[PDB]
GROMACS .gro file of C-alpha atoms in nm:
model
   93
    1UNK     CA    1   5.278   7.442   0.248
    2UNK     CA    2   5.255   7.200   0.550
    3UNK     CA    3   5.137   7.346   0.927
    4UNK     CA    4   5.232   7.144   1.191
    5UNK     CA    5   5.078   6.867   1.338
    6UNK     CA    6   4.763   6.829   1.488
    7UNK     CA    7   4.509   6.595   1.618
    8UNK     CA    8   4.334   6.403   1.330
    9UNK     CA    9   4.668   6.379   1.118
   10UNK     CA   10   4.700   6.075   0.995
   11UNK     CA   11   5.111   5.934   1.013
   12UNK     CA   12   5.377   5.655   0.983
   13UNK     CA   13   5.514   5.672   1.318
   14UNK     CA   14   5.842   5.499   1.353
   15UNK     CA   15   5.983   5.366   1.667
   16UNK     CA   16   6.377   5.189   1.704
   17UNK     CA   17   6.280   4.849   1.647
   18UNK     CA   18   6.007   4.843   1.471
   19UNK     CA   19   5.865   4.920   1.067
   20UNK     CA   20   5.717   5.240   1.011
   21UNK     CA   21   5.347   5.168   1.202
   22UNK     CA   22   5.015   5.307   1.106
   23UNK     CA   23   4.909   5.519   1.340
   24UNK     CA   24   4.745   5.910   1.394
   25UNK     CA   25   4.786   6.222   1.627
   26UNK     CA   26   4.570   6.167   1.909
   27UNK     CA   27   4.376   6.438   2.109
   28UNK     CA   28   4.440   6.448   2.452
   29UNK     CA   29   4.097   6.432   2.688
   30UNK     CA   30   4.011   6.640   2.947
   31UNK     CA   31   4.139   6.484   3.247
   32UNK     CA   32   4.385   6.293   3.030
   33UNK     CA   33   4.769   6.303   3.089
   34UNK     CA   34   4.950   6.557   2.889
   35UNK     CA   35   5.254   6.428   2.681
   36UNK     CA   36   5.594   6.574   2.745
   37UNK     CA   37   5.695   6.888   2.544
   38UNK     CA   38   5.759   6.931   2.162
   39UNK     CA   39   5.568   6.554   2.180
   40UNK     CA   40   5.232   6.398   2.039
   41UNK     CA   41   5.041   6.182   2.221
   42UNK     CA   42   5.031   5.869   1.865
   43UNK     CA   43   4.784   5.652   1.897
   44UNK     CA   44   4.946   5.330   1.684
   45UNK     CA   45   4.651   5.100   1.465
   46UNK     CA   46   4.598   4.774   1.485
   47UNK     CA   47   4.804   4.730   1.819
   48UNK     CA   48   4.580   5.068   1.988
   49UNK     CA   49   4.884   5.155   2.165
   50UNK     CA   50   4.980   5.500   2.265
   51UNK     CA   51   5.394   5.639   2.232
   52UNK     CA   52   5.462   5.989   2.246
   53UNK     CA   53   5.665   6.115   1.962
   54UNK     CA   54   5.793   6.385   1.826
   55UNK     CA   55   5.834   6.505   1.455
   56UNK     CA   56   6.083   6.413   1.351
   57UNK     CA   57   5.973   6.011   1.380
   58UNK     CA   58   5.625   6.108   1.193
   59UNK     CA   59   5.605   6.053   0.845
   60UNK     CA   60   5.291   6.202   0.691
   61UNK     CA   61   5.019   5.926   0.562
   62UNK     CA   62   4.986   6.026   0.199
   63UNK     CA   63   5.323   6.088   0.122
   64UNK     CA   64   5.470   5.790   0.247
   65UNK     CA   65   5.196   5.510   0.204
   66UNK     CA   66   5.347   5.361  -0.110
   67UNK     CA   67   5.668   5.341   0.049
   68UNK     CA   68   5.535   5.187   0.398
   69UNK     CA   69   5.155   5.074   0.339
   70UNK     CA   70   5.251   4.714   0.267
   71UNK     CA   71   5.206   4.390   0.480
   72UNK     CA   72   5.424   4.307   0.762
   73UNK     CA   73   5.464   3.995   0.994
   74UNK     CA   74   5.454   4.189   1.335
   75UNK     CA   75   5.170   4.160   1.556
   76UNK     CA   76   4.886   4.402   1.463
   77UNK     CA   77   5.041   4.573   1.191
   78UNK     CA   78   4.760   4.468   0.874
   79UNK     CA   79   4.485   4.511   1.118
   80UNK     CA   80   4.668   4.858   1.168
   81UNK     CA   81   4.690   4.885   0.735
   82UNK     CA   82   4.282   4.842   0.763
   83UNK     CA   83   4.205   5.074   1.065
   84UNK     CA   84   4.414   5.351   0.886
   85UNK     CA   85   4.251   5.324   0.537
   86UNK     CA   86   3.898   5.252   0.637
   87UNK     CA   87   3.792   5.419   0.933
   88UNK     CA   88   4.116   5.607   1.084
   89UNK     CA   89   3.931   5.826   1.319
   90UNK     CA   90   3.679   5.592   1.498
   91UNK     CA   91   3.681   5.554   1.879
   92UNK     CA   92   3.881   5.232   1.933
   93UNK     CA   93   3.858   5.238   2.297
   0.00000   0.00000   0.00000
Protein backbone atom coordinates (compact mmCIF):
# COMPACT_ATOMS: atom_id res chain seq x y z
CA UNK A 1 0.00 0.00 0.00
CA UNK A 2 1.29 3.58 -0.75
CA UNK A 3 2.94 5.90 2.36
CA UNK A 4 2.95 9.30 1.71
CA UNK A 5 5.24 11.33 0.04
CA UNK A 6 8.66 11.94 0.61
CA UNK A 7 11.80 13.38 -0.68
CA UNK A 8 13.23 11.23 -3.57
CA UNK A 9 9.63 10.40 -4.99
CA UNK A 10 9.64 10.71 -8.28
CA UNK A 11 5.99 12.56 -9.74
CA UNK A 12 3.89 14.20 -12.55
CA UNK A 13 3.24 17.40 -10.96
CA UNK A 14 0.48 19.31 -12.57
CA UNK A 15 0.03 22.97 -12.43
CA UNK A 16 -3.36 25.11 -14.11
CA UNK A 17 -1.91 25.79 -17.31
CA UNK A 18 0.36 23.56 -17.97
CA UNK A 19 0.74 19.36 -19.03
CA UNK A 20 1.45 17.12 -16.34
CA UNK A 21 5.54 18.08 -15.84
CA UNK A 22 8.26 15.77 -14.81
CA UNK A 23 9.38 16.61 -11.78
CA UNK A 24 10.33 14.98 -7.95
CA UNK A 25 9.84 15.78 -4.14
CA UNK A 26 12.61 17.87 -3.19
CA UNK A 27 14.38 17.93 0.27
CA UNK A 28 14.47 21.02 1.88
CA UNK A 29 18.28 22.21 3.06
CA UNK A 30 19.26 23.34 6.16
CA UNK A 31 18.93 26.93 6.05
CA UNK A 32 16.47 26.53 3.18
CA UNK A 33 12.89 28.03 3.27
CA UNK A 34 10.27 25.72 4.48
CA UNK A 35 7.16 25.28 2.15
CA UNK A 36 3.75 26.12 3.50
CA UNK A 37 1.79 23.32 5.29
CA UNK A 38 0.30 20.01 3.87
CA UNK A 39 2.87 21.25 0.76
CA UNK A 40 6.09 19.79 -1.03
CA UNK A 41 8.71 21.77 -1.97
CA UNK A 42 8.64 19.99 -6.37
CA UNK A 43 11.49 20.52 -7.97
CA UNK A 44 10.09 20.49 -11.91
CA UNK A 45 12.89 18.77 -14.73
CA UNK A 46 14.04 20.18 -17.49
CA UNK A 47 12.85 23.81 -16.51
CA UNK A 48 14.72 23.24 -12.58
CA UNK A 49 12.00 25.22 -11.22
CA UNK A 50 10.65 24.88 -7.77
CA UNK A 51 6.34 25.12 -6.99
CA UNK A 52 5.08 23.93 -3.87
CA UNK A 53 2.30 21.49 -4.20
CA UNK A 54 0.28 19.51 -2.52
CA UNK A 55 -1.10 15.91 -3.18
CA UNK A 56 -3.54 16.07 -4.66
CA UNK A 57 -1.68 17.73 -8.01
CA UNK A 58 1.10 14.76 -7.75
CA UNK A 59 0.67 11.93 -9.81
CA UNK A 60 3.09 9.13 -8.97
CA UNK A 61 5.95 8.45 -11.81
CA UNK A 62 5.33 4.80 -12.56
CA UNK A 63 1.82 4.78 -12.60
CA UNK A 64 1.22 7.52 -14.78
CA UNK A 65 4.28 7.60 -17.26
CA UNK A 66 2.45 5.91 -20.13
CA UNK A 67 -0.26 8.24 -19.81
CA UNK A 68 2.03 11.55 -19.49
CA UNK A 69 5.76 10.50 -20.48
CA UNK A 70 5.36 11.66 -24.07
CA UNK A 71 6.84 14.76 -25.93
CA UNK A 72 5.48 18.14 -25.54
CA UNK A 73 6.16 21.57 -27.27
CA UNK A 74 6.60 23.66 -23.99
CA UNK A 75 9.84 24.94 -23.02
CA UNK A 76 11.92 22.35 -21.10
CA UNK A 77 9.56 19.68 -20.94
CA UNK A 78 11.79 16.63 -23.12
CA UNK A 79 14.86 17.82 -21.42
CA UNK A 80 12.56 17.27 -18.25
CA UNK A 81 11.40 13.47 -20.00
CA UNK A 82 15.45 12.81 -19.96
CA UNK A 83 16.39 14.23 -16.47
CA UNK A 84 13.50 12.07 -14.98
CA UNK A 85 14.39 8.72 -16.70
CA UNK A 86 18.12 8.94 -16.63
CA UNK A 87 19.45 10.51 -13.72
CA UNK A 88 16.30 11.89 -11.60
CA UNK A 89 18.15 12.50 -8.44
CA UNK A 90 21.38 14.36 -9.52
CA UNK A 91 22.23 17.82 -8.12
CA UNK A 92 21.01 20.19 -10.86
CA UNK A 93 21.98 23.25 -9.14
Amino acid sequence: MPHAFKPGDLVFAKMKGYPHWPARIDDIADGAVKPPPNKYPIFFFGTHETAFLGPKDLFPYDKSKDKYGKPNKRKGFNEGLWEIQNNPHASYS
